[PDB]
Design a protein around this ligand. Structure first.
Ligand SMILES: Nc1nc2c(ncn2[C@@H]2O[C@H](COP(=O)(O)OP(=O)(O)O)[C@@H](O)[C@H]2O)c(=O)[nH]1
Lengths: 371, 179
């Protein structure tokens, strides 16, 4: 079995001593890196399978967790198992066809680049983006859910202690498994890059490897961005619930805006600022820029309310909104709703001139994107 | 118990992975050094206290700012690394790494680690750095930085020679046991 063979700490130890002696240093080095990819992929699959076969299965059977509770700890686990089982088997296939003579021990992989380009392009890439985007995007919630269950659910705690006691190693407790999975994807560029630089005179392999290196970075870049989307969604939900059903704001159109309108909006940026009314008093408020609308909220009685400012709409469509600096006031900024017969102007004051400028740029960017 | 989590951070190429590997591995990697580090739970004893010290690498996450901080929650000690052959990697310590680490890990102790100390007296290194009128980081510059960022302490090491490696993790463990 390969699982038994993969106990070998290095390529130089999995092959015969006689066969090792016949190879150049730079060959040994290159095979050592490929073996490491292969063996750490093996380890990763095993980790996923512990999450599924030990933890998930036990939670469902012993604690009567439904499928959907396990998804709060281990989202997309089945799909991850499918992706990496298949990737790993493709690596084994190439290994098997790289054996030397009738030996089933000694192998020498001349070419791995094509296997990598395939796994990290087309539909395989999209699957990786979608799956890691969701898993990493929910990573902190997943761990937080574990911690709350462990701290407060007596049965869950007892269950976890029993698993740690006998079934699985310390390295693979539940949050540790989650972090192992989240960290896997960013291991690939380092490994691929080292294989490339260890590949000295094979242009098609060098070219493939180069390609796979860039492609995996694109996958990671998209995953990282998707995590930013989840940070924004989770943050918007913090605000939405903090707002209480009580508060309402009329928009320039006449449309009444309320707490439930804040979902399912998409948040761009939020932060504390000050509104300046016509009397010139500064009112502490959360600027909440959404993709289509700008909202201002006062924190009163430990809950958010739609801010009041001289009977003006503080729920503002970005459609025909114009953004200007306040002349001779570096921390200030004007918002003019040109889509009315009496365009309402709203003056807002930041913590600094730097923060004032950044608020103007992102609002302008958000307006430009919208139209 | 006693279970502590350790995370290592620092610029790309400063020796984060090599340090974890040479510390963790049962036999020192004389011929092949692995490219990556998965995770590890080291059994280590300092001042008559048995600790299970989990080790985590951030290598690979330096460029991905939403992914990297997923490594931070529940950390009991941070190894914050620069390379002695890279004054540029030292200036990133207060400028990038310190505010990130203190924000994601408030009140978690930091060990400032100067890696690749075998290269301080390396002539090739001295010539390359000298092109930019730079030189290797001096031990005092390291200690002064540790003080300016509020580090629990300063340690120098070489993963190549293993010199100073055991002391880095023994210190880190002491830091982790504090309250
Ligand atoms: N001379 C010397 N080189 C080292 C030492 N530690 C690591 N390196 C090398 O520096 C490079 C980057 O090491 P790595 O651990 O990958 O850095 P990372 O990007 O922080 O993970 C590799 O070529 C290592 O072999 C060291 O202690 N001395």
């Amino acid at each position: 079995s390969m699982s038994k063979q993969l106990e070998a700490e290095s390529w130089s130890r999995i092959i015969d001593s006689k066969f090792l002696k016949q190879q150049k240093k730079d060959v040994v080095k290159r095979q050592e890196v490929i073996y490491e990819l292969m063996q750490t992929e093996f380890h990763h699959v095993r980790t996923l399978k512990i999450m599924s076969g030990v933890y998930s299965q036990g939670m469902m059977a012993d604690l009567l967790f439904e499928q959907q509770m396990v998804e709060k700890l281990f989202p997309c686990l089945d799909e991850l198992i499918s992706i990496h089982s298949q990737f790993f088997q493709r690596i084994l296939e190439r290994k098997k066809e790289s054996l030397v003579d009738k030996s089933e021990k000694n192998f020498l992989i001349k070419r791995i680049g094509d296997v990598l380009v395939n796994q990290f392009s087309g539909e395989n890439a999209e699957r990786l983006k979608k799956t890691y985007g969701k898993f990493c995007g929910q990573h902190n919630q997943s761990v937080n859910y574990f911690k709350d269950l462990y701290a407060k659910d007596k049965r869950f705690q007892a269950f976890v202690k029993k698993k740690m006691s006998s079934s699985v190693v310390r390295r693979l407790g539940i949050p540790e498994c989650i972090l192992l999975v989240t960290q896997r994807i960013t291991k690939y560029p380092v490994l691929f890059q080292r294989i490339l630089q260890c590949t000295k005179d094979n242009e098609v392999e060098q070219e493939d490897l180069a390609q796979s290196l860039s492609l995996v970075k694109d996958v990671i870049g998209a995953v990282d961005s998707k995590v930013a989307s989840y940070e924004k969604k989770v943050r918007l939900n913090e605000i939405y619930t903090k707002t209480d059903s009580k508060s309402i704001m009329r928009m320039k159109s006449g449309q009444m805006f309320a707490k439930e309108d804040l979902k399912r909006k998409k948040l761009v940026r939020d932060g504390s600022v000050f509104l300046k009314n016509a009397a010139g008093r500064l009112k502490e408020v959360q600027a909440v820029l959404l993709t289509d609308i700008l909202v201002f909220l006062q924190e009163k009685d430990q809950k958010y309310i739609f801010a009041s400012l001289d009977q003006k709409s503080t729920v503002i469509s970005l459609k025909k909104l114009i953004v200007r600096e306040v002349a001779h006031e570096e921390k200030g900024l004007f918002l003019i709703s040109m889509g009315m017969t009496d365009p309402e102007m709203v003056e807002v004051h930041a913590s600094s001139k730097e923060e004032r400028n950044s608020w103007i740029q992102i609002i302008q960017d958000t307006i430009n994107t919208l139209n | 118990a006693i279970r502590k989590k350790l995370v290592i951070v620092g610029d790309g190429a400063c020796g984060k992975t090599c340090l974890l590997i040479v510390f963790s591995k049962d036999q020192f990697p004389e011929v092949y050094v692995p490219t990556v580090f998965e995770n590890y739970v080291a059994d280590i004893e300092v001042d008559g206290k048995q600790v299970e010290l989990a080790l985590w690498d951030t290598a690979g996450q330096e460029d991905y700012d939403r992914l990297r901080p997923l490594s931070y929650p529940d950390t009991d000690v941070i190894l914050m690394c620069f390379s002695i052959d890279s004054p540029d990697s030292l200036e990133n310590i207060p400028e990038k790494w310190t505010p990130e680490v203190k924000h994601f890990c408030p009140n978690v102790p930091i060990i400032l680690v100067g890696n690749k100390k075998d290269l301080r007296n390396d002539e090739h290194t001295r010539r390359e750095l000298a092109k930019m009128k730079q030189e290797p980081v001096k031990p005092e510059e390291g200690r002064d930085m540790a003080n300016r960022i509020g580090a629990f302490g300063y340690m120098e090491c070489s993963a190549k020679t293993k010199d100073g490696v055991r002391e880095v993790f023994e210190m880190a463990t002491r830091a982790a046991l504090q309250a």
